[PDB]
Amino acid sequence: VPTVFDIYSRLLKERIVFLVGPVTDESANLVVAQLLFLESANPDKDIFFYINSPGGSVTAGMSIYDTMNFIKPDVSTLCLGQAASMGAFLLSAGEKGKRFALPNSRIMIHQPLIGGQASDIEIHARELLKIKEKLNRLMAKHCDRDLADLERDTDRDNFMSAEEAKEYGLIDQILENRA
Amino acid sequence: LVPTVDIYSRLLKERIVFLVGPVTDESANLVVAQLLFLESANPDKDIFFYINSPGGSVTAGMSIYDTMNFIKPDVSTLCLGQAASMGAFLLSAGEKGKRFALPNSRIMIHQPLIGGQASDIEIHARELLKIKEKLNRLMAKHCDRDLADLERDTDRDNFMSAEEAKEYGLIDQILENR
Amino acid sequence: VPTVFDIYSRLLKERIVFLVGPVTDESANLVVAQLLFLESANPDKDIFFYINSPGGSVTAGMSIYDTMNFIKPDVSTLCLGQAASMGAFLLSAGEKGKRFALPNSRIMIHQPLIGGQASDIEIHARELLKIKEKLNRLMAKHCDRDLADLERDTDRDNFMSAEEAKEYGLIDQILEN
Amino acid sequence: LVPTVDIYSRLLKERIVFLVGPVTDESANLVVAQLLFLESANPDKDIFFYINSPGGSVTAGMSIYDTMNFIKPDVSTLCLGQAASMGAFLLSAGEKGKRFALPNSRIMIHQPLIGGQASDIEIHARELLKIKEKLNRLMAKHCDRDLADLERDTDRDNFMSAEEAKEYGLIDQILENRAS
Amino acid sequence: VPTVFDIYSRLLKERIVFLVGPVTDESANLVVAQLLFLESANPDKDIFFYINSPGGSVTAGMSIYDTMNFIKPDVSTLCLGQAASMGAFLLSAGEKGKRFALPNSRIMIHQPLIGGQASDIEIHARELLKIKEKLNRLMAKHCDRDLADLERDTDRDNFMSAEEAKEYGLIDQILENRA
Amino acid sequence: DIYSRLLKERIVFLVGPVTDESANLVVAQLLFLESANPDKDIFFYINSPGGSVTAGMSIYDTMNFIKPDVSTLCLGQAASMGAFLLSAGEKGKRFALPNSRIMIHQPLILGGQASDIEIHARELLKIKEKLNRLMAKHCDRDLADLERDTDRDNFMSAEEAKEYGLIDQILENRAS
Amino acid sequence: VPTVFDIYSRLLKERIVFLVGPVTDESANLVVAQLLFLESANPDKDIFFYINSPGGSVTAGMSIYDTMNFIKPDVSTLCLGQAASMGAFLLSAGEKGKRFALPNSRIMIHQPLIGGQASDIEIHARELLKIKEKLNRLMAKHCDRDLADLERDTDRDNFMSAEEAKEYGLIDQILENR
Amino acid sequence: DIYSRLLKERIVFLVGPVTDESANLVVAQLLFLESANPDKDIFFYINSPGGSVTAGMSIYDTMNFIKPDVSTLCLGQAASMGAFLLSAGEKGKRFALPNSRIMIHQPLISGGQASDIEIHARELLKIKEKLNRLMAKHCDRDLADLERDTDRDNFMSAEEAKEYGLIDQILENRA
Amino acid sequence: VPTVFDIYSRLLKERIVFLVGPVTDESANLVVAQLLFLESANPDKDIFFYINSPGGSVTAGMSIYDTMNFIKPDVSTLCLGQAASMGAFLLSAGEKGKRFALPNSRIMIHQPLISGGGQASDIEIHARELLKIKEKLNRLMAKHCDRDLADLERDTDRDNFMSAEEAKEYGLIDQILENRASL
Amino acid sequence: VPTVFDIYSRLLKERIVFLVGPVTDESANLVVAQLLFLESANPDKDIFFYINSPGGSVTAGMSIYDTMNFIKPDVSTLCLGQAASMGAFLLSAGEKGKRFALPNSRIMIHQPLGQASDIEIHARELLKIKEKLNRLMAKHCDRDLADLERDTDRDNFMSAEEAKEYGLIDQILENRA
Amino acid sequence: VPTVFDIYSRLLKERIVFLVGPVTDESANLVVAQLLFLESANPDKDIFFYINSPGGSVTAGMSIYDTMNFIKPDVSTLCLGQAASMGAFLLSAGEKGKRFALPNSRIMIHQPLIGQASDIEIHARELLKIKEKLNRLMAKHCDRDLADLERDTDRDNFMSAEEAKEYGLIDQILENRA
């Protein structure tokens, strides 16, 4: 990684935080640390959360999500490349009015995707359905849409262009350039 | 690897059928074939089904189970060594009055023990719970026991001596010798 | 890890300690070391213990547990993402009144989960059963509930929402902002 | 690999049954099958059970054991090479007076030796201790010895020569050849 | 590992040395190095040796042990989490009156645990039995107990609570907090 | 098949490592040949590098238990337990082909508690002494000789094995 | 393996024995057994030993070698494809006057080619050198050559055509056809 | 069984790679047919990618040693030692089916001290030369043709193999 | 690794050199490097060579050995934990009068042990080279221990474990240090 | 690796260069680089090249060899532990009069160890290398080429005194004296 | 790597760039980066490109090649140990008059070596274009005919320093300075 600070610490001074690749406990907590630090350094400036992610652990994503809503700054989100699964969830979670996509980004949403006694399998199956329902309800709120729409539209992989994510309510604008 | 006189075919002429080791599709279907053959050879004589099994596939066991009840001969069952999981299920399924265990065999019963979208996981969880309820249903009827007992007594591994299995209703008698 | 001093050392200066991922001897002792350091830096200001963990070693969590209660600072605990098994145990062990969860966190509690001669298997099974009862008694005290409640409610994996963990007595408050 | 005259089928109607190698479900049931066959062929003639085994599954061994006692023929046992763990149990289980060892055989006895929730481990530990006690008590009866003796002498591996196994009560005689 | 000096170097400046995880040649010599340094820095102040260990190499543990007794500072020991096998041996080896455990610590002691010609197997079995006897004798000295007690009490795994280790003589006090 | 045909001439082969399976197959053939005729000699052909001590002991006690004299012939090699079984043939009827080799050595193998390792090491030392003592009897030599000569691998020509007492004669052809 | 009897047992009735592939304990003893059988079947007729082998175990090869010299029939040897290392040794060991090679056969001879304490390595190296000398001495006898020639000519791999092997004394004739 | 049945028709198969075992099985069948009838032709059907050269030599010298004419027929392909064996059939009785493929090339090693490497390279070069000379004799061609034409893999159709001299006729059907 | 200079570099400033774990070309040369550095820094002060090792490569151990005797500082040796095989050889090679062990150290000596082919010519060459190494080591060991070579040949035929007291009575070390007072 | 500068960088200030372990492209070029630096730092002072190597790649060893002869400083060589195969060649290549061995070093010399067209090419290239090596080695030892041909046919192990008598080294160093 | 500033950064300050080992995308671009860096620091002094390589990726080596010819500094080349395949290509690519080999260096040149039939056709044609292109550039570097390079690279062609000099692949052999 190039030096200037390494390149990512330098962009962190511009209040840019990256989520790249799969959402894990380690990578999500690293995002949480950066969000908390930027709040401490200046609670009155927006944070820019750049997401290029295929998704990953749901609980790890919730840790980013609840921190995005916990801190004082608006967390603006930008999809570059793609935001799929929890990646799309976090992108839609940006401060409404400040959710963005680059013109050739793609968004993908779907239902949750994944041994023991039947008793244990019942427990984990139930918990998996609970997560699926919670995600649909939170997603509908982010998109300002009906819950039935989200249930139907996430049964299988649902790929969207940037323009489609906008009409869906997942993002607010597509950014061509600075202009 | 198996002596000639072969020994298992020789004991089949005595209407002896063995289930040894885990219940899989080919081993279970091998039993079905022997049960069907012995009925064909003489539908008026009992069959003796010797079980030393730790269990295995539930659907494979059902094929033996429904075949035991389908044919005309009484299927007497004998536990030697152990009858666990589907092995205990099949042993309990012998003709009532003709279910036996050797004095130091052991019986074990328990609930069923085992990826994709949440929809698919829901579906397969539903089927596993149905099988679990079905199994407690058939088992209580085999034991002349009430359904609540079987649900409670199979939540975890339940090991029984031959005498306990008799008390439970799983077998009828313990045979020390002839 | 971005440098600002790296991001985690920077947050350590504000008395933030993270438990992320499985509880092992080295992940646990790194926390113990940070707890002892923050006590040395100022034994009278609260420590904020952020937990996003699926659980892990019981003895490793015990070293964190006794250290939390040994040092002078109140250790406030925060569940982000999830606190499962020993993670949920540590979460419940924070200073009463200062145990928190974020609104979409989950908590999970359960009984302990894991060769040789029968004598040896007898010894280790008995030690495992001692550990199981010890955790139930300590968990019941953290939650201000009867031992019967914890024994019954930890027989299999028990997932709780933030509020359910709140009624259980496992945490005190849910933090929205 | 087994010559023709196969060798084991031919010796089978001298009423000789072999247990060689580990006691598994397959190997145990093959023995069970042979015992039942010889009883059917002649319920009034002795069976000669040759044991060279390091042991194996206890339930599998129990299938042979209960079968030895179930059939009508006396089951004579002979230790060649070694009879250890369940092998020694089966050797000791032959008809009293007809249990033998060759002079440089070895016998070994010991207590049973082998994941999940603590509840499940508790259950399987309890079952393993039941087996340990059951085996000690049955062994003390075979050896005409005290249960307290079998508990002490099986805490760790206990190797016995043919003379020691005879003094323990596990076998009746040592056979060097036809005299004896 | 965080910075404030890294976290362990800074706790080392307060004469705290950690033994964590399995006792190997490498992890044991690092403790020895820290013990030699703290004595050099001040031979008249106590050293605090925190042990959370499942055990490990016996000779590696002896290197720590003989170093604790060789240097001039008193080596106080504290068991946190667990001190098992050689971990328990080193814990019991602390300066008498200054051996401690946290309330939910656990202690475990047991006898030693592990090819060629019979001649070679005889030599190594005898050497292993020599180690078993030496360890029992040193342990009995640490615990102020009879050698026969240690032979009986280490035949198989012997797990002790903090109170049981104190009553055994393996530690001196249980510390709930600073008070 | 070729081996069954030679079995009808009372020839039994031990080829390769002595295992439970390879030893018991030899035992079964020995018992069979005794059943067919307990009064004619058996010819035990050995080309083996050794193996399990208890497996070979089952062969050993069977050779001495049955009524037939068991004559032994070493072809290629008789090493360790192969050499023990070769040495165990009926005295006067132990033979080697001229370019065979014999090798003898002490037992060669631990994981558990020190108590167990003590038990198994002592059991191994009993075996070592037992083998030296039985070997000394086969060779009409002192136990002291065998202890000294098996401490490490001791390779012998047919002539050396004959002078040691391990075999009785070297057979170039049936002109004894 | 076609049935004609299998093809190899059928050729045994013509007194043909094959050594194919590496010389192992098992493959050598299979040859030993066939030689003993043919002697039993008729001790007064020649045996035809066809060798296509790259070599292998020296002790296993010695079991064939001493059996060839022990039995009453002349053992005639034929090299087809190749006789290398112990393969060449056994070929050269056939009854003098009855050692043959097919015209495009190749023969190769060489010295022996292969852990513990230094005491053990000394024992096994010295034992390997005894084999080296013995093999050179026996080879010199088969070839009617001086031992020094064999020590020099086997120091590294020595490939010979059929004519070269005849000129060396390793075989007696080259056979193009009957 | 089907292959023993065709053996009674004096048909011998080589299918798949030439190894010591597969070549000797062919040698054994050839000797069996000669003893059963030394005066009737043998039909050697080859569908092979090649393999061991010495193993291939054992079949070759057996074809020429026994008294029966060994006629060869290529079905599928005869490559490397397969093509060598095909070309070695009795002159006038080497055949291919019309969509057979033939391939010839110089020796190829798949897989010590410099002294040993010198010895083994030289022996490989003798083999390469011997094969070229034997091939040129089978093909009624110049040695120089075989050396250049086997420098790399040379695939030939049935017509081409016939024009090269590797076989005598192409058999479309029983006419 | 804790920092104060890291902890080992810090002890290097006190002329302490560690050999921990197996003797390889890698670890031996790192020891050789530190020995030469300390001689360069001060050729007239003692070096303290602390050994806790199971042994390893003989030639690698020889490079340490000849560096100990080549450089001008006395190389005092201390065994902690254990010195086995080449570890015990290096320990016994310390400056006479300055070889030490901690009380519960273990020493083990034995003949060369190879683990892990070629023509008998090559095997003859390598076997004889190993016997030369075995003899050379016994002779150096007998000189280090001030005892007869016949003693070292007999006493290294198999693994020979010694306590700190036994190693001193054998002549491998000079003193056992219980603490600094023991001097 | 200790700090004083790491230990090897510090010894470079004494003009000490090590070759340890197998001679590969990378470890040989690392040596080449150090030779170039010391010549750059002072082209008129000797370089001390310490060799403890079992040998390895011949082309890699040649890159060291020609650099030793290209640079202006004398390259003195010292064998510690062993100089085998390419290790011995480099040792023998030090400046005549400044080639040394420690008393218990060992030296070993020996000869070097697709389609038939390709195997021919590579075998003959290996034989040229064998020939090259025997000739240069003969120059280093001031001996007959025939001697090196005989003495490297199989592994030739030498004590330091034997290597000195052979002409491979100039002196044996017991200590600074 | 010793930290005098590791050793290579320190020789980089003397405008020495090394290529050691296989030519990969990483190993080539690191060379490209140093070449551009040295041009930026000073576009008017020669660069010394030290090559010890067995070859590798053709496109990776081309990135070095075009960069050597793109920058303003003369790129002098030195072969140490060996320059093989693309290593030899880059060695031959140095500024005419300034390509050198150490006296016991070795050079080796050869032709390139490494789906549906349509795809295999495309990649075969692309591989044959590369072969001709490399031969044409090589012929220009050596002042030789394309026909020479095609004949001399059909199989591995190993050259001494003197042979490489006579071929036109290098200009001078340096035992020491000029």
Q: Which residues contact A152 (CB under 8 A, 6 or more apart)?
A: none
SS3 F48: strand
SS3 of F54-81: the string is HHHHHHHHHHHHCCCCEEEEEEEEEECH
Q: Give the fold, CATH level 3, of E1-179.
A: 2-enoyl-CoA Hydratase; Chain A, domain 1 (3.90.226)
Catalytic positions of A are 85, 110
**Residue F111 burial (CB count, 10 A):** 9
Cβ contact B–A (≥3 pairs, < 8 Å): yes
**Of all helices (H) and strands (E), which one includes residue H13?**
strand H11-15
Contact indicator for D106, D84 with CB cutoff of 8 Å: yes
8 Å CB contact between I20 and E29: yes
Euclidean distance between CA atoms E156 and K162, whole angstroms:
76
Interface membership of E155 toward F (CB under 8 Å): yes
E30 and I1 within 8 Å at the Cβ level: the answer is yes
- Distance between CA atoms of residues G93 and G87, nearest Å: 10
Among E142, E88, E84, E100, which Cα is nearest to E16's?
A: E100
Closest CA to D22 of D65, D55, D49, D59: D55
Q: What's the rounded Cα separation, in Å, for the pair D153 and D159?
A: 10
Residue of B nearest to D30 (CA): B2
Query: Per CATH, is H1-175 categorized as 3.90.700.10?
Result: no
Task: Flag if F114 and E132 touch (Cβ within 8 Å).
Answer: yes
Nearest residue in I to J106, CA atom? I59
Residue J148: alpha-carbon gap to chain centroid: 16
User: CA–CA separation, I146 vs G144, rounded Å?
Assistant: 58
DSSP-H helix ranges across chain C: 7-12, 25-41, 58-70, 86-92, 118-143, 147-153, 162-168
Distance from CA of D117 to the nearest CA of C (A): 4
CATH of domain D1-180: 3.90.226.10
What are the structural domain ranges in chain K? 1-178
Contact at 8 Å (CB) between A27 and A61?
no
Q: Of J80, J97, J107, which Cα lies nearest the Cα of J161?
A: J107
Contact K87, K170 (CB under 8 A): no
Task: Point out the residue among E12, E67, E72 whose CB comes nearest to the CB of I80.
Answer: E67
Query: Around Cβ J164, how many Cβ atoms within 10 Å?
Result: 18
DSSP string, J131-147: HHHHHHHHHHHT--HHH
Give K 38-67 residues with CB within 8 A of chain J: 50, 52-54
Do the Cβ atoms of K69 and K24 come closer than 8 Å?
A: no
Place of tokens 């132990």: F94
Please write down the HEC assignment for all residues of chain K. CCCCCCHHHHHHCCCEEEEECCECHHHHHHHHHHHHHHHHHCCCCCEEEEEEECCECHHHHHHHHHHHHHCCCCEEEEEEEEEECHHHHHHHHCCCCCEEECCCCEEEECCCCCCCHHHHHHHHHHHHHHHHHHHHHHHHHHCCCHHHHHHHCCCCEEEEHHHHHHHCCCCEECCCCC
Q: How many CB pairs under 8 A join B and D?
A: 90
| DSSP H/E element including G31 | helix G25-41
**CB neighbours (10 Å) of residue E99?**
24
F50's CB contacts (< 8 A; 6+ apart) are F17, F18, F56, F79, F80, F81, F82, F83
- Asked if D79 contacts D100 with a C-beta cutoff of 8 angstroms, the reply is yes
CB proximity F173 to E under 8 Å: no
Can chain I be said to touch chain E, i.e. do they have 3 or more Cβ pairs within 8 angstroms?
Answer: yes
Task: List the alpha helices (DSSP H) in chain H.
Answer: 2-7, 20-36, 53-65, 81-87, 114-139, 143-149, 158-164
**Residue A178 has what DSSP assignment?**
-
Query: Six-digit token pair at G125?
Result: 């190296």
CA-based nearest distance F123→chain E, Å: 10
Question: Which chains have 3+ CB pairs within 8 A of D?
Answer: B, C, F
Superfamily of domain G1-178, CATH level 4: 2-enoyl-CoA Hydratase; Chain A, domain 1 (3.90.226.10)
Query: What angle (nearest 5°) sits at the alpha carbon of residue E71, between those of residues E68 and E73?
Result: 90
Q: Is A89 on the interface with C (CB under 8 A)?
A: no
The CATH architecture one would assign to domain F1-176 is Alpha-Beta Complex (3.90)
CA distance between the termini of chain G? 27
Confirm or reject contact between C9 and chain E (CB < 8 A). Answer: yes
- Indicate yes or no: CB of E5 within 8 angstroms of CB of I3: yes
Q: Is D20 on the interface with B (CB under 8 A)?
A: no
Residue pairs spanning A and B at CB distance below 8 A: 51
Q: Which residues contact H19 (CB under 8 A, 6 or more apart)?
A: H51, H52, H55
Of D21, B29, G153, nearest in space to F20 by CA: D21
Residue H157 near residue H170, CB atoms below 8 Å? no
Cβ–Cβ contact H35 with G under 8 A: yes
Residue at token pair 């650099």: J67
Task: From chain J, pick out residues whose CB is under 8 angstroms from the CB of H53.
Answer: none
List the one residue out of B17, B91, B25, B15 whose CA is nearest residue B53.
B91
Reading the block at residue F175, the tokens are 């002109």
Exposure b/e, F52-78, CB count within 10 A at least 16 = b: bbbbbbbbbbbbebbebbbbbbbbbbb
How far, in Å, CA of I160 to CA of I88, rounded? 11
Q: Which residues of C touch E2 (CB under 8 A)?
A: 6, 8-9, 12, 30, 34
The two structure tokens encoding residue H88: 């070695």
Provide CB contacts within 8 A for B40, sequence distance 6+: none
What is the DSSP code (8-state) at residue J20?
E
CB contact under 8 A, D72 and B20: no
Q: Topology of domain I1-183, per CATH?
A: 2-enoyl-CoA Hydratase; Chain A, domain 1 (3.90.226)
Task: Specify which residues C65 forms β-bridges with.
Answer: none
Q: Which two tokens stand for residue E23?
A: 């006792």
K166 class by beta-carbon count within 10 Å (0-12 exposed, 13-18 middle, 19+ buried): exposed
Angle between the I120-144 and G118-143 helix axes, to the nearest 10 degrees? 150
Active site residues of I: 85, 110
Which CATH fold would you assign to the domain J1-177?
2-enoyl-CoA Hydratase; Chain A, domain 1 (3.90.226)
The single residue listed with the structure tokens 């083990």 is I108
Query: How many other CB atoms are there within 10 angstroms of residue D72's CB atom?
Result: 11
